[PDB]
């Protein structure tokens, strides 16, 4: 099955048909075609083979000009084996990026055009314009600015004054100069040192830069050497750094490669419900449609219901539903929601489906006319509210087989109506002692008498409690345009709130466009380091947006175009959800806009997506063959599938998606294996100038990413207080439908595998991995890492911790794997207690039955960590509240948020929370002995 029969269409109309090898590249195929075409008619009229370019229909159903004739036919992957010769004309660069974009984001660009939506076309035109602008400006910036953009500094949060040697090498020279430097030297200072060494065994230091050997990580800036990630890791590990001298000139080579006012329309709001379509329900029941207006999650009037109609595929109502609100009182973000349900005749209510629609379009126009809303199927939940107002306003893309409602907005004016501009809003919004006591009492759900007081002294809230803006936003009555006008008046003059408050304002409870713009305006203070910490939550709240062109998409694209690493992870956060029909349209547009501004990183991402495709096919081969053949003989069947030229070339010489600065060069086929358990994850080893990755297919790795991200956030928050608990914050990255990669920590093994070779194998393994003097250091790393992961797992509610899902590093560092559930969930919910393990307590006590001093130090480590986490509990709460948009099954209601409130004891003072934590620790100590005595 090595050959494939290919059809060839020549520009003279001649047709040819012969088999070629599936693995030959397009250049070889063209030479073969030219050798056969000379014996076919009209050959004397074609030009040379190099005047033409192959054209095919790719997997995304688009025409593509196959410009890279070094691509194998199996890598091109045409729909049918049909190649057409066409002329080398046109922009060619634009046609190239247009085709590679459709294959990279997993959706054809033509699918956007076919929608015939002006909002889509306006988004693409504006967003792709701005992105191409930023890409063009970046190409003009200096070499130092480009080295910034492509590789931002990887720095520690942050220091003694040590001095150690370093191996500095030059480009293309095996000779390398080793010399000592101080840990507080700026990299320019060490730069000039290697220079005066080179000229005496006459360039200038500020013309060069420093690169880590075997990695796309660079050392520069006005920072001390100790603050760098690679250097700081080199000191604790004991290894001497290995750097490379790079001229600026080598960096440039990388860089080159009509006025009817709405408020005068006092008539009530109404719609015309007409017909349903493609309804599949029980024939004995009746169909009802529920409808209600919403601003965020708040009702704006009563839930006006329709009458019962017999169940059928195309039910007809033709009824008018009138709502208890006037047109002049509908907010800008007024969100009207339907829910079709089946009810037993009056003589177990079943929500069939639901659909939401904005009353104003993206151009601020009140929608009038016929609307066809393709619904989403209703999923049963805990709060069986028929109306689902938190759902997306986007339509179901499955248009040929999904149900829909035909509704009609009535004409209200001869000229169309808009929502008033900001100036017309501020004109409306422009117009004691005892009360200050209750204001402080309330701001330190609300209640009716308290709601009206906060709205009464709204100016006092702005002038004395600015961080309470979110509370004032909720008490505002949005169903009254006068109240709205006054609130937006105060909002347009609110002082700048810290990032913490802005994080809360990004929730779905605050849907006003003015609110989101105020929040984003406060998030602009974020550093790239801090913004990366919340990148995952920021992407998730995009599902909360009502329009395509929004402030948050603007901000995320801004930062992605300014920081290549941020753009890299923004790409994968969106690409890994393109199989979700709710966000495929919005994400695909953002992804296309991002690619047009990052033609360079497009090449890296293309290479990564191809390797991920090969791994999926590889894992599929292993899954199918692991059930019939024992694991020993399945490994070489893997190996045989990997050493294929297409497979080997695709899995080699790429940037890791888990870290774009990590280079995955040569595949160690021999060291590659798999796991003969569930999911059959792959273990892929590499060797550069030795990194591993884990390809897991079958499970959504988003919850595991959030878990590891939250652990990594605790590590940064602790290091900001001078508390280094020797964490192992390895990375986890979902790349597609139940597909992701897991970073591999070298020199690590499970608790179990070490305890199977009385149970002192833990201490003995540490002695054999840290001989003599190194033991003490290893025990200390174990003590700190045990405390931080004990506190982390208790705070996040991660139970089911046993010898299989805890690992040890050869340095003594402990860490966890395979977080199946969090927030107290198990095979059911319940608070996971604080857990101490005697097998571990044996190691902190250095083998002694009683080592009080060491144990009190370990308890101080635990308590200081828990104390620091309590200081940032609002950050964790806000991040989790935004994370509810992700749809994780164990993060969907306020009870999951309440788990973090109780685990961190945010309702109690620091004294009372520390005392209760003391009691929990003590009971965990008492439970650790009873754990293994049985």
């Amino acid at each position: 099955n090595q050959s494939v029969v290919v059809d060839f269409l020549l520009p003279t109309g001649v047709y040819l048909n012969f088999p070629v090898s599936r693995n030959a590249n397009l250049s070889t195929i063209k030479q073969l075609l030219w050798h056969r075409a000379q014996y076919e008619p009209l050959f004397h009229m074609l030009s040379g083979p190099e005047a033409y370019v192959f054209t095919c229909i790719n997997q995304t159903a688009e025409q593509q000009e196959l410009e890279d004739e070094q691509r194998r036919l199996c890598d091109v992957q045409p729909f049918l084996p049909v190649l057409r010769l066409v002329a080398r004309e046109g922009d060619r660069v634009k046609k190239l990026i247009n085709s590679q974009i459709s294959l990279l984001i997993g959706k054809g660009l033509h699918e956007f055009d076919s929608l015939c939506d002006p909002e889509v076309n306006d988004f693409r035109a504006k967003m792709c314009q701005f992105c191409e602008e930023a890409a063009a400006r970046r190409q003009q910036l200096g070499w130092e600015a480009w080295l910034q953009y492509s590789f931002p500094l990887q720095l520690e949060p942050s220091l003694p004054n040590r001095a150690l040697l370093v191996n500095v090498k030059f480009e293309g020279s095996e000779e390398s100069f080793t010399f000592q430097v101080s840990t507080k030297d700026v990299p320019l200072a060490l730069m000039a040192c290697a220079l005066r060494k080179k000229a005496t065994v006459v360039e200038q230091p500020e013309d060069y830069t420093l690169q880590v050997n075997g990695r796309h990580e660079y050392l520069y800036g006005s920072y001390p050497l100790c603050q760098f990630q690679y250097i700081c890791s080199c000191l604790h590990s004991g290894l001497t750094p290995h750097l490379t001298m790079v001229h600026s000139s080598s960096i440039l080579a990388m860089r080159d490669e009509s006025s009817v006012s709405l408020w005068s329309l006092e008539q009530p709001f109404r719609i015309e419900l007409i017909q349903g379509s493609k309804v599949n329900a029980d024939e004995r029941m009746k169909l009802v449609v529920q409808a209600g207006l919403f601003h965020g999650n708040e009702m704006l009037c009563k839930t006006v219901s329709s009458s019962e109609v017999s169940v059928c595929s195309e039910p007809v109502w033709k009824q008018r539903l009138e709502f208890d609100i006037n047109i002049c009182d509908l907010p800008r973000m007024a969100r009207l929601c339907f829910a079709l349900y089946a009810v037993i005749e009056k003589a177990a209510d079943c929500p069939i489906a639901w659909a939401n629609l904005m009353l104003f379009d993206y151009k601020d126009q009140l929608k009038t006319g016929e609307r066809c809303l393709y619904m989403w199927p209703s999923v049963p939940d805990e709060k069986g509210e028929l109306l689902n107002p938190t759902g997306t306003v986007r339509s179901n893309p499955n248009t040929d087989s999904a149900a829909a409602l035909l509704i009609c907005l009535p004409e209200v004016a001869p000229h169309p109506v808009y929502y008033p501009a900001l100036e017309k809003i501020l004109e409306l919004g422009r117009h004691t002692e005892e009360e200050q006591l209750q204001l402080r009492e309330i701001l330190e759900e609300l209640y009716e008498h308290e709601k009206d007081l906060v709205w009464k002294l709204r100016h006092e809230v702005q002038e004395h409690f600015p961080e309470a803006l979110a509370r004032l936003l909720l008490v505002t009555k949005w169903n009254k345009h006068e109240d709205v006008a006054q609130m937006l008046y105060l909002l347009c003059s609110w002082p700048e709130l810290p990032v913490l408050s802005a994080l809360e304002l990004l929730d779905f409870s605050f849907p006003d466009c003015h609110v989101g713009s105020f929040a984003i305006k406060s998030l602009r203070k974020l550093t790239d380091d801090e913004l990366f910490q919340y990148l995952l939550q920021l992407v998730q709240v995009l599902k909360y947006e009502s329009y395509l062109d929004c402030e948050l998409t603007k901000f995320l694209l801004d930062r992605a175009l300014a920081n290549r690493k941020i753009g890299h992870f923004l790409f994968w956060h969106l690409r890994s959800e393109m199989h979700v029909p709710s966000v495929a349209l919005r994400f695909g547009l953002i992804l296309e806009a991002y690619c047009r501004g990052s033609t360079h990183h497009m090449k890296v991402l293309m290479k990564q997506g191809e390797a991920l495709s090969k791994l999926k096919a590889l894992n599929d081969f292993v899954k199918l063959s692991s059930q019939k053949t024992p694991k020993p003989q399945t490994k070489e069947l893997m190996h045989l599938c990997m050493r294929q030229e297409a497979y080997l070339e695709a899995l080699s010489h790429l940037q890791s998606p888990l870290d774009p600065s990590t280079l995955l060069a040569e595949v160690c086929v021999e060291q590659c294996t798999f796991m003969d358990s569930k999911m059959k994850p792959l273990w892929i080893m590499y060797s550069n100038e030795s990194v591993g990755i884990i390809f897991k297919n079958g499970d959504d790795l988003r919850q595991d990413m959030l878990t590891l991200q939250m652990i990594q956030l605790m590590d940064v928050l602790w290091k900001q207080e001078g508390l280094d608990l020797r964490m192992t914050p390895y990375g986890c990255l979902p790349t597609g439908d139940r597909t992701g990669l897991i970073e591999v920590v070298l020199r690590s093994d499970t608790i179990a595998n070490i305890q199977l070779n009385n149970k002192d194998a833990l201490l003995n393994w540490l002695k054999s991995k840290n001989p003599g003097e190194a033991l003490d250091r290893a025990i200390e790393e174990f003590t700190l890492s045990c405390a931080g992961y004990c506190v982390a797992t208790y705070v996040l509610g991660i139970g089911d911790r046993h010898s299989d899902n805890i690992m040890i590093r050869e340095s003594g560092q402990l860490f966890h794997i395979d977080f199946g559930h969090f927030l107290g969930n198990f095979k059911n919910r319940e608070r996971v207690p604080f857990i101490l393990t005697y097998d571990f307590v044996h190691v902190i006590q250095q083998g002694k039955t009683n080592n009080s001093e060491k144990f009190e130090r370990f308890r101080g480590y635990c308590e200081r960590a828990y104390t620091i986490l309590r200081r940032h509990g609002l950050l964790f709460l806000h991040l989790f509240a935004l994370m509810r948009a992700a749809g994780l099954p164990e993060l969907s209601c306020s009870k999951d948020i309440q788990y973090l409130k109780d685990s961190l004891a945010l309702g109690k003072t620091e004294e009372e929370a520390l005392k209760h934590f003391r009691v929990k620790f003590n009971e965990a100590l008492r439970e650790s002995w009873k754990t293994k005595v049985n």
């Binding site: 059809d7 269409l9 520009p11 003279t12 109309g13 001649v14 047709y15 048909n17 076919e40 008619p41 009209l42 054209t55 229909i57 997997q59 995304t60 159903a61 688009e62 025409q63 729909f79 049918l80 049909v82 057409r84 054809g108 699918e111 493609k278 599949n280 329900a281 029980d282 089946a342 177990a348 209510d349 079943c350 929500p351 069939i352 199927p377 209703s378 999923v379 049963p380 069986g384 893309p397 499955n398 040929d400 087989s401 199989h579 029909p581 439908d737």
Partner: protein
């Protein structure tokens, strides 16, 4: 004066707890069945979209083949006439036979596209029946959840400890 709608086997605590176990068992069973159906719903939706974009790719392939036919009918004209007034009718036969081969190839692709069209029609009815089965399962599923919660509240009011409740919910 207060006559709330209590619908429980109001009797001994052990009997209500027994039926609490049976209702919770049925609820978890119905939930597993619905989750199986919802998985089939998601897979069928993915496959239907795959077949629909593959239909567009067939459309684009046939479009290119019809462009080739038109290009031939124009480009051939000048030559075909000259070869005739030159005795090269053997080569006219060559051009005409080659163009006939292009025609038959179009018919093959047309046939394969119609086959995928029929597969999509079948899967479209498959999708509609999976959604109908889900819609005939939900009423029970929600009723089973409400009954389980009602028995749980009755037991909680009577003073049953959390341990016995966990025993009945296992």
């Amino acid at each position: 004066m207060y006559q709330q709608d209590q619908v429980v086997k109001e009797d001994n605590i052990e009997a209500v707890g027994k039926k609490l176990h049976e209702y919770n068992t049925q609820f978890q069973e119905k939930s597993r069945e619905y989750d199986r159906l919802y998985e089939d719903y998601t897979r069928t939706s993915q496959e239907i979209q795959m077949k629909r974009t593959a239909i567009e790719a067939f459309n684009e392939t046939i479009k290119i083949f019809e462009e080739q036919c038109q290009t031939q009918e124009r480009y051939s004209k000048e030559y075909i006439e000259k070869f005739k007034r030159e005795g090269n009718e053997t080569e006219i036969q060559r051009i005409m036979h080659n163009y006939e081969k292009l025609k038959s190839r179009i018919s093959e692709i047309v046939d394969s596209r119609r086959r995928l069209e029929e597969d999509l029609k079948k899967q479209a009815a498959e999708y509609r029946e999976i959604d109908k089965r889900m819609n005939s399962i939900k009423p029970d599923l929600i009723q089973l959840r409400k009954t389980r919660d009602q028995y749980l509240m009755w037991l909680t009011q009577k003073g049953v400890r959390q341990k016995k409740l966990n025993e009945w919910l296992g």
